[PDB]
Design a protein around this ligand. Structure first.
Ligand SMILES: Cn1c(=O)n(CCCO)c(=O)c2c1nc(OC1CC(C)(C)N(O)C(C)(C)C1)n2Cc1ccc(Cl)cc1
Ligand SMILES: Cn1c(=O)n(CCCO)c(=O)c2c1nc(OC1CC(C)(C)N(O)C(C)(C)C1)n2Cc1ccc(Cl)cc1
Ligand SMILES: CC(C)CCC[C@@H](C)[C@H]1CC[C@H]2[C@@H]3CC=C4C[C@@H](OC(=O)CCC(=O)O)CC[C@]4(C)[C@H]3CC[C@]12C
Ligand SMILES: CC(C)CCC[C@@H](C)[C@H]1CC[C@H]2[C@@H]3CC=C4C[C@@H](OC(=O)CCC(=O)O)CC[C@]4(C)[C@H]3CC[C@]12C
Ligand SMILES: [Ca+2]
Ligand SMILES: [Ca+2]
Lengths: 702, 50, 702
């Protein structure tokens, strides 16, 4: 009618009035009342000690809820049903209740069937409770690899996919617990590295629950960094960062022997671990080996020093070849000195690239097969060193990791173009033997192609210098952030390409009828690169270029007119061009700006850690003694168990102290959390109520 | 003389600002709980009957 | 030395050991120990009951600090020095302590000398404590007007400017207290309106303490808004909003004069008060008088009925002239109907403006003094109505209207240009009496000037339509926000104006030597508006235009060349132009974008309240009976004390209920929103400590 009648739709069994008062005594902390009710129920059988409150909490759960230990024992002495009260006690994190339930030796539950006491204890991250359970010989299921097709993995995901996914996530939540790792992991730092990396990969395959796995991975990364924060001496830091996880094997003498664990952290992308200030401070000492007081020096002394060694790079390179053991032959081995020498050896190459077009000899513009000039001869040894150095990393590093770095893609294209230029120059030298005016050369003359290929390589070579910004504290953080914004921009370029193709097809479909010949155009020039632009939309290839150039306003409006002056056709074509301008320049261009502003804000809060990780990779590439000589000069031609066992003993001693300090700090950091909840107010109120009842029980003259 | 008065006022203000600035922590709840437990045990020493 | 020796630099008098334990008893809540020490102090004279702890807190201040009333009476009974104890009790907000000190009847203090018990109580905003003090016949100094030159204001400012400024702010903090206003203000809503407005003006004169006064003004605005929120019926809301504070004449017909309190709120810029949903709901009922179910109607029905009334605007206007009391003559008086009729009468005017350029008799391009055409004759009555409406509205509005809203500036310029056009066409009609080819007309021919002036007015008339966006829910909020961004943009144009002048002076100083004559230019055209631009920087006036047009890329680069081909001069001039382009287009343009983005974010959070305030002013301008006829038709030609007393009695009754509800809500809102502090933890600990000591004193057995 005009009123909605409210009733209980899913009614449960009602609780007797006798049981209602019995539960109220437990909440109030009334020990005396509870003791009588339990004793009375032993004979009369009037109240149910296992009274199931519709909420599911029995007296035992209420006793655990309030942390009232003494009443708990009073109920447990009466043979009350236990069920899974251990999980409830563990979740409450009351050590007294957990110990009592351990020593003590259909239904609705707040926990899924897969949760075990050890797994739940690790979820809470309580060191004390986890230690109690681990001491009682507990185990946790081992999760299968992400890409597993075994019968169990496939069959389990068939019967119940929801339960299978939740069970796997619960296991990883327990394994990623810092308290469990510190207690049961032989090498907690390595365990956190591998576990966090495995969780990051899981967050991709299991995209539905990506956020959950990414939070676990971040938790593992934080734990390793926090363990490193507890180092108190340089000796402790040296032991941790130089530890080898029992490699044995053979180590390349050309490689860098030390910092084994730091390199492992870089491999697993532990950016916070690498960016730790004490780790960074140690790295700077190695990087600045020859300058003990580099930081204290004025910016003028630094700048003046850099050019001095840079100008002497030819001399240092020669010394390393002639007398490597000599005093001067050892300077090039210092990582920062070697970095400056390589940079100087590259700035010299770029300077000679400028000189290629600054020297012109008349009558040499017509030699079809001209030989290398003076500048080209000096450039040649540099190019061979660059190609040799890149191939030297092909076998040394491998195909897979080389392509992972975007700067290597530019290095490959640059070297390929230089190789093509050399071969093309050779073919022209052999095929032709005279001079002919350049105006009569064909479109695809080998000399013309070589000049274009050489010029393209020059642009790529110059752009390579941007990678050196990582070494600078002012430019490196900005350069790294700019490269992180390019991935977002590339996605937006997919939508613009669809728009460009859609309008290019429509415009070409309309204008291809009116294509004219170059002979009929003024100056005999056809296309949009002429002084009087024409045939803008005659072909699809030309149409794509015309729409590209209109983005910069370089396409004139009169290109929409045809010679026949078909008014309706011209207006329609100009409306397509106008609509394209609105979509690309008024809408899409501004949308990219809005997205870039939002994406840069997020990138800006992690710029420091990202740059420091990038600079660490740059520094470590100069610690090795493999590529000491710059490109100009790089082409000129027992029982180990005792050592490994002792090295492991020292690592274990340091790990033991780090865990002790970390555990205390985390236990300390919780007591100052600066927050309170209702469960604390409930517990405090219950304490007074219990005290009041106990005091009142001792009445006097009644 | 002026510096002496400024420090006196500043110290009182900072001591004042703390008692109203930050909320309670776990260390306060533990302290309050222990106070009741100590009082309960001390009172229970004088048991009139048992 | 290599160590810094730390010592007490400003040492105070040390406190005896006997006094140290005496104070510790007060903090612990040990009543028994304090009672004996005080009683012993009456004989031995060993400890001073007034022991001044270096912190300044005596026993009395400690007793007040812990809210231990029983002990505080114990010390008060012993004749301890009080001093400024009342202020400390008031600040603590302990009602029990304040009553005790009131009934009880240079040292360091935490309060400035100007603070009084009533002022401090108002600062805390405690209703209960403020009521206790007000009942005891207290008063507060009246602050002088902001611009006061009396002997006291000038002498106080010169004697002690710092103390004078602080005393004024302390008084205004007390007067702006919502609790004090609710208790002692005859009309709390009016008091909050005036007090908040006065504080906003003060925040401008007092530049140093602008933030403090702006927070007080915001506090007054919130209080009035919150009082209105407590209205529970439409009758209560009607009584509040229709209340007239005074009864001086105020009976002019053709005036709505029915929402006096609401109009007062608009005058004082009480935007939150006006934007209150219940106030807005009542206004919409009056605005939609003829459409009881406007909100429930589909957007198509709404749109269909808008054109029907708009097309009928000529008929409704006539009816209001012939038979105002008739059924049809009353429709135009409904505010929403009248608004549509005025809008329709204006869209018709704009339509005829378009027709002025479509129907011009051919061969009449040469009539020097042409008479008005067909379209001009119809436009004439509209213009006279617009001019008459502005003069008519200015007579009652006053000569201060032009400074209120920037839309009236456009109406003044638009009407002035229309008047100039009419006079100019009259002069041409009388001066000339024939037709002559337009090519031979002089630069300042009256007919040419009139055409230019008329065209400028057309742009202004069309732009006027933007003000109608305020009535729309979708466009109004955006249009209002755009107008709020224009004030920030105007600041930026000051920096760009100086940059433009700096480079214009430099470029003209360099190029004025090479000015050429129009006869020597191709096509005899001189300037940058020619097909081949020339003389871009010949004169300062031309240089300013050239730099303006380069902002849009309409100035070609070749204008930097001179005929004599002075290479050094041309390069310098092109470098000035290039530097100007960098500063204006790469730097200043982007800085404006960054500034606009930041300012829009702040404006966006207040857009709803600002738009609703603007729309309320729009609606209320159509409630009055004065300007019912649109411009086209707007030129055609008993004891009052008894009513005022009853109207005031009902207002007081409603105000009494609103204050009661508001006070309870604020007392309610504090107990569920404010978190705990150290003062609460200290109080709770002391309670247990006091109880523990009291119990142990009397064992109660044996
Ligand atoms: C896409 N487009 C176009 O291609 N041309 C060139 C045609 C061939 O020259 C146009 O002129 C043209 C056009 N969009 C036009 O208005 C749009 C522009 C945008 C920015 C999308 N907003 O904001 C609105 C408010 C929707 C108006 N106009 C101008 C125009 C308008 C009316 C008439 Cl009757 C004639 C022209
Ligand atoms: C103001 N200015 C200018 O007026 N002209 C026109 C001269 C007359 O044609 C230029 O060519 C010109 C110029 N600023 C130039 O470089 C600047 C441009 C800005 C954007 C300010 N950033 O980013 C830096 C990195 C500082 C380079 N260049 C180009 C140039 C550079 C070197 C040489 Cl040797 C010759 C030209
Ligand atoms: C006029 C423009 C094109 C610049 C000149 C061209 C080159 C000579 C520049 C381009 C990038 C420059 C490099 C950018 C970054 C660095 C890292 C920098 O390393 C540090 O010692 C940084 C120390 C710090 O962190 O402050 C040493 C100079 C170097 C190699 C620069 C050397 C000079 C380079 C090659
Ligand atoms: C293309 C140009 C030349 C058209 C003419 C100018 C417009 C900007 C005018 C014509 C009709 C006007 C509208 C006439 C009536 C309404 C309805 C009115 O809304 C209501 O009262 C209904 C509830 C709501 O939508 O807020 C708000 C103003 C608005 C949108 C007006 C805003 C200004 C408009 C769109
Ligand atoms: Ca490479
Ligand atoms: Ca006006």
């Amino acid at each position: 009618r005009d009123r909605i009648p409210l009733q209980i739709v899913r009614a449960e069994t009602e609780l007797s009035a006798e049981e209602k008062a019995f539960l109220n005594a437990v909440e109030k902390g009334d020990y005396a009342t509870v003791k009588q009710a339990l004793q009375e129920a032993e004979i009369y059988y009037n109240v149910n000690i296992n009274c199931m409150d519709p909420l599911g909490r029995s007296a035992l759960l209420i006793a655990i809820e309030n942390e009232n230990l003494e009443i708990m024992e009073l109920l447990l002495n009466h043979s009350v049903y236990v069920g899974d009260a251990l999980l409830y006690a563990i979740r409450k994190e009351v050590v007294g209740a957990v110990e009592l339930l351990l020593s003590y030796r259909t239904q609705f539950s707040e926990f899924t069937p897969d949760i075990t006491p050890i797994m739940l204890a690790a979820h809470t991250n309580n060191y004390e409770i986890i230690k109690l359970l681990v001491q009682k010989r507990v185990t946790i299921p081992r999760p299968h690899q992400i890409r597993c097709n075994c019968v169990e993995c496939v069959s389990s995901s068939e019967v119940d996919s929801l339960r299978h996914s939740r069970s796997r996530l619960n296991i990883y939540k327990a394994l990623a617990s810092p308290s469990l790792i510190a207690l049961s992991s032989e090498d907690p730092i390595l365990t956190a590295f591998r576990l966090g990396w495995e969780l990051k990969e899981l967050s991709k395959v299991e995209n539905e629950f990506k956020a959950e796995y990414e939070e676990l991975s971040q938790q593992c990364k934080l734990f390793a960094k926090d363990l490193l924060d507890q180092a108190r001496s340089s000796r402790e830091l040296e032991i941790i960062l130089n530890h080898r996880d029992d490699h044995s094997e053979e180590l390349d003498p050309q490689k860098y022997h030390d910092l084994a664990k730091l390199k492992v952290a870089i491999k697993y992308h532990q950016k916070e671990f690498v960016a730790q200030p004490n780790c960074q401070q140690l790295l700077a000492t190695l990087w600045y080996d020859g300058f003990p007081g580099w930081r204290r020096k004025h910016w003028v002394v630094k700048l003046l020093t850099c050019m001095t060694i840079g100008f002497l790079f030819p001399m240092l390179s020669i010394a390393y070849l002639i007398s490597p053991r000599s005093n001067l032959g050892l300077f090039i081995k210092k990582p920062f000195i070697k970095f400056i020498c390589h940079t100087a050896s590259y700035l010299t190459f770029l300077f000679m690239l400028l000189l290629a077009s600054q020297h012109i000899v008349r009558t040499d513009l017509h030699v079809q097969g001209p030989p290398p000039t003076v500048v080209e001869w000096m450039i040649l040894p540099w190019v061979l060193g660059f190609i040799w150095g890149e191939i030297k990393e092909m076998w040394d590093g491998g195909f897979t990791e080389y392509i992972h770095d975007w700067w290597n893609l530019m290095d490959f294209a640059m070297n390929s173009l230089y190789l093509a230029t050399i071969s093309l120059k050779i073919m022209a030298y052999v095929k032709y033997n005279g001079s002919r005016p350049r105006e009569e050369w064909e479109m695809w003359h080998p000399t013309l192609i070589a000049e274009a290929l050489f010029a393209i390589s020059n642009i790529l070579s110059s752009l390579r210098l941007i990678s050196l910004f990582t070494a600078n504290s002012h430019l490196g953080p900005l350069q790294i952030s700019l490269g992180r914004m390019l991935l977002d921009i590339l996605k937006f370029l997919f939508i613009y390409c669809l728009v460009l193709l859609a309008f290019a097809n429509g415009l070409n479909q309309l204008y291809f009828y009116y294509e004219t010949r170059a002979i009929d155009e003024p100056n005999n020039c056809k296309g949009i690169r002429c002084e009087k632009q024409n045939n803008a939309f005659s072909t699809l290839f030309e149409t794509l270029q015309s729409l590209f150039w209109s983005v910069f306003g370089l396409l004139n409006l009169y290109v929409t007119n045809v010679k026949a002056r078909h008014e309706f056709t011209e207006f329609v074509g100009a409306t397509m061009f106008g609509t394209y301008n609105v979509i690309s320049l008024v809408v899409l261009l501004n949308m990219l700006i809005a997205m870039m502003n939002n994406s840069y804000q997020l990138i800006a809060d992690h710029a420091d850690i990202e740059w420091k990780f990038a600079r660490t990779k740059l520094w470590m590439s100069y610690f090795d003694e493999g590529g000491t000589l710059p490109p100009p000069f790089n082409i000129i031609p027992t029982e180990r168990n005792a050592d490994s066992l002792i090295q492991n003993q020292h690592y274990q001693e340091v790990i033991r102290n780090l865990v002790k300090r970390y555990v205390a700090a985390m236990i300390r950091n919780s007591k100052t959390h600066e927050g309170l909840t209702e469960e604390n107010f409930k517990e405090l109120k219950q304490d007074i109520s219990s005290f009041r009842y106990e005091v009142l029980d001792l009445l006097g003259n009644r």
